């Protein structure tokens, strides 16, 4: 062999219980002896008549396997020693069966690890002389905490009480478990069913039929169904549905997830794992809401005046589904006349003579059909000032919020039944690409809080109309949410002198220069040689205004002209300059 320098011997055995002591005897062939003990191949331990046979007692062997080398430095021999324990009696013994067609498997807890190769056996016994047995080897690599028995006894014969036993063997000492018992009526875990489909009926998204195919012995079933709005899943129970069920009170045109679980007996068997989640598309439904339609009155001429058609849908209850068609109807109330058109967009323009009353209606035609014809009686765009309310005050505590408060008019508030509030932007001329944006507020409510379709540092125009069937009130004012100082001021373009009055004309300063609502202008003029405070004239801003008069100055003396554009939060710096000698 290889230990040609003698031999080594152990007492009692290379396998020992935990914490014991071992006698190691080295013998040399007839005609210093050191011991090397290595913990997981790491040197942590170290040290002629007596050398012919040297005996040592070794204690405090650590948890694991270690090597003793008896070296005379030239080696003689050695022995590999291991320490371990008897296996713990196993606990929490359970068993599993899968449906009508499925064998029996079992699981158990082995407890502590012995750091040594052990094995387990699993005995099944039962009446009418049935028995089976299989083993499993658990070692440093493979762990046996579950096993399959491989026999599929009949699940229909559920009148037997069977016995499960698990036993553990190792080199040191055997161990057993409780002679566990199990009722066969509840050992079977059913497999999830198949062919779970959804059929749509009754032409309404609330009504559906759900089908599946499973064993006909199943008595209890549960269904999980929910949309993607929330992670919560709507559960429903059923007893003896026999493969089919009907579902009512469902949200229409909402994608749904569908899952199913089964149960063979109310007091026997066990539940079933959920099947694959099914994605189902719920068909459309006809909306029953009412959408407001907004209009404008621009007077091209007395007999060819322009009427705008505006609406906006933003909720999945009035424009639910694949909506494509819009049948618009304009009716005259005083005389029996109507005009029809088909539109695909949210805006339209029409030319009507001014004579006669108006009623504007539009439909919401999805694939299912057309919704209720949304119609609004129309009065003149701006009516009498008697019902016109007082000055609406706008306060902006946020860059994207305006609170508007309108006082009740001098006329009683009993006549007005509804208030309409509309905001738009401003242009040097006329605007039609950008739609005005609207909202409705009842007169009983005090104020209106708008926080949508609004951008700070742009001057907007708000208008409020008291809606009455005879003659509603009308008012309007300009405002912005947040404004800063303008970057600069516009130009003094044209200067003229006529009828002892000096006229200054300018152009429209562009949009980014304002950075909000421009509120007024301040024109400063002085003499060329005058270094004192220049004298000032104040102009209140009007959008249509582009010229300003000023009184006669000192003749034959030159004058210097400039101006600034002043808002509430800031002032534009000085722009261009003008010199004029009258």
């Amino acid at each position: 062999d290889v230990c040609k320098l003698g031999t080594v011997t152990v007492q009692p055995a290379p396998v020992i219980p935990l914490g014991s002591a071992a006698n190691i005897s080295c013998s040399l062939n007839p005609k210093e002896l050191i011991l090397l003990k290595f913990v997981n191949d790491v040197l942590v331990e170290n040290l002629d008549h007596t050398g012919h046979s040297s005996t040592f007692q070794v204690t405090n062997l650590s948890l694991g396997m270690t090597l003793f080398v008896c070296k005379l430095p030239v080696p003689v021999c050695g022995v590999e020693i291991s320490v371990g324990v008897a296996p713990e009696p196993p606990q929490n013994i359970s068993c599993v069966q899968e449906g009508e067609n499925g064998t029996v498997a079992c699981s158990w807890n082995s407890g502590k690890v012995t750091y040594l190769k052990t094995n387990y056996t699993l005995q099944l016994s039962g009446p009418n002389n049935l028995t089976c047995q299989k083993q499993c080897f658990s070692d440093n690599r493979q762990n046996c905490n579950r096993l399959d028995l491989g026999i599929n006894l009949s699940p229909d014969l559920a009148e037997s009480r069977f016995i499960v036993r698990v036993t553990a063997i190792n080199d040191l000492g055997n161990s057993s478990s409780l002679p566990h018992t199990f009722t066969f009526l509840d050992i079977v875990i059913p497999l999830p069913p198949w062919d779970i489909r959804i059929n749509f009926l009754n032409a309404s998204g609330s009504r559906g039929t759900l089908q599946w195919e499973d064993e006909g012995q199943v008595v209890l079933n549960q269904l999980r169904y929910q949309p993607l709005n929330s992670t919560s899943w709507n559960m429903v129970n059923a007893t003896n549905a026999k493969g089919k069920y009907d579902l009512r009170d469902l949200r229409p045109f909402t994608e749904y997830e569908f899952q199913i679980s089964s149960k063979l007996h109310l007091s026997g068997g066990s539940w079933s794992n959920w099947s694959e989640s099914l994605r189902t598309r719920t068909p459309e439904e006809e909306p029953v809401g009412i959408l407001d339609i907004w209009y404008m009155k621009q007077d091209i001429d007395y007999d060819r005046q322009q009427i705008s058609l505006f609406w906006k849908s933003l909720n999945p209850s009035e424009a639910r589904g694949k909506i494509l068609h819009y049948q618009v109807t304009l009716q005259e109330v005083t005389k029996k006349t109507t005009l029809q058109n088909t539109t695909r967009h949210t805006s339209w323009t029409r030319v009507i003579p001014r004579t006669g009353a108006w009623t504007a209606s539009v439909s919401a035609a999805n694939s299912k059909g057309a919704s209720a014809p949304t119609h609004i009686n129309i009065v003149d765009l701006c009516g009498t000032g008697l019902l016109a309310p007082h000055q609406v005050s706008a306060k902006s505590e946020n860059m994207d919020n305006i609170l508007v408060t309108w006082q009740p008019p001098k006329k009683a508030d009993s006549a007005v039944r509804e208030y309409i509030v509309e905001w738009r932007a401003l242009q040097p001329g006329s605007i039609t690409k950008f739609p005005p944006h609207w909202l409705r507020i009842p007169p009983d409510n005090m104020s209106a809080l708008i926080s949508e379709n609004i951008k700070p540092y742009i001057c907007y125009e708000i208008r409020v109309h008291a809606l009455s069937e005879s003659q509603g009130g009308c008012s309007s004012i300009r405002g912005d949410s947040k404004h800063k100082a303008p970057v600069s001021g516009p130009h003094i373009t044209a200067i003229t002198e006529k009828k002892e009055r000096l006229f200054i004309s300018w152009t429209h300063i562009p949009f980014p220069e304002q950075r909000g609502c421009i509120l007024h202008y301040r024109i400063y003029w002085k003499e060329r040689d005058s270094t004192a405070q220049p004298e000032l004239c104040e102009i209140q801003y009007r959008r249509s205004q582009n010229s300003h008069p000023i009184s006669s100055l000192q003749p034959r003396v030159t004058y210097v002209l400039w101006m600034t554009a002043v808002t509430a939060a800031g002032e534009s710096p000085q722009g261009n300059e003008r010199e004029f000698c009258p």
Partner: protein, 156 residues
């Protein structure tokens, strides 16, 4: 040819002896304790010599090329076969005994075992265990070196 397979065998044996030196360093695997498995049909170390290195002449196959046919070198090929037979037998024994216990610190990579197997196809037709593997490797390294030498000289 057997030459490229022999180079593969040398490379994988060098890799294995590197792994054995790294792992079984505490074991006696450094010094040499040089003793080989074979002693009777040791004609590997006496016949596997070139032509012009014979000074005293007294002391079928597929990888013997027709250009270098000889009535001597067939004995060298046969001795190589028998030595490979003994080496593979006791290496199969040591590999089988290596897994009956729970020590998995050294694992014979099957590269050299399949190299020996293909070479056989081409040519013809406790604690004692680690020490026996170590001395088997310490002789097999020089044996595969000799086989590479004689294959390179013969085939080329």
């Amino acid at each position: 040819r057997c030459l490229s397979q022999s180079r593969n065998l040398l490379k994988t044996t060098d890799d294995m002896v590197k792994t054995a030196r790294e792992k079984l360093k505490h074991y006696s695997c450094t010094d040499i304790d040089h003793e080989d498995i074979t002693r009777d049909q040791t004609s590997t170390l006496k016949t596997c010599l070139p032509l012009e290195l014979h000074k005293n002449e007294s002391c079928r196959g597929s990888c013997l090329p027709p250009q270098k046919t000889s009535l001597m070198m067939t004995l060298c090929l046969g001795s190589i076969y028998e030595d490979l037979k003994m080496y593979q037998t006791e290496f199969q024994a040591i590999n089988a005994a290596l897994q009956n216990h729970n020590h998995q610190q050294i694992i014979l990579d099957k590269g050299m075992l399949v190299a020996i197997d293909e070479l056989m196809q081409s040519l013809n037709h406790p604690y004692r265990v680690k020490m026996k593997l170590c001395i088997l490797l310490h002789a097999f390294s020089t044996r595969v070196v000799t086989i590479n030498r004689v294959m390179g000289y013969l085939s080329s």
